[PDB]
Amino acid sequence: MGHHHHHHSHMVVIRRLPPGLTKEQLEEQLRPLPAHDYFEFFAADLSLYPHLYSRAYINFRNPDDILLFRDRFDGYIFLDSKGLEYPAVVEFAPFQK
C-alpha cells in the first residue's frame, strides 16, 4: 500500500475583477482547465453592481497545468453585454502550508 507520487498542486488567484457578472458566467473562463480543482467564485449583478469588490480563487492538480493556462490568461479582456472590459490577471497565490 502506498501512493504513485503526483507532482505538487500550487494555488492560483485572479486579479482586476470589477463587480458585474455572476460566478455562473465568471468561472466559465476561470476553471476550463484539464487537470484542476476550483474554489469559491463571487457573484454580481451588472444591472447596478453591489458596490463591493470580491476575488475569485483557483486550484490545480498539476504544476504543468499551471504554466499552461497561467500564460494564456495573463491579463486578457473578457467583454460583457454592456462591453464591460474584464482584464483578468492570473497569478500564483501566497502559498500557505
From Swiss-Prot:
Residues 12-82 are annotated as: Required for interaction with UPF2. It is found in: Nucleus; Cytoplasm. Isoform 1 is strongly expressed in testis, uterus, muscle, fetal brain and spinal cord. Isoform 2 is strongly expressed in fetal brain and spinal cord. Found in a post-splicing messenger ribonucleoprotein (mRNP) complex. Associates with the exon junction complex (EJC). Interacts with UPF2 and RBM8A. Interacts with DHX34; the interaction is RNA-independent. Belongs to the RENT3 family. Involved in nonsense-mediated decay (NMD) of mRNAs containing premature stop codons by associating with the nuclear exon junction complex (EJC) and serving as link between the EJC core and NMD machinery. Recruits UPF2 at the cytoplasmic side of the nuclear envelope and the subsequent formation of an UPF1-UPF2-UPF3 surveillance complex (including UPF1 bound to release factors at the stalled ribosome) is believed to activate NMD. However, UPF3A is shown to be only marginally active in NMD as compared to UPF3B. Binds spliced mRNA upstream of exon-exon junctions. This is Regulator of nonsense transcripts 3A. It comes from Homo sapiens. The gene is UPF3A. The chain holds residues 70 to 155 of 476 of the full protein.
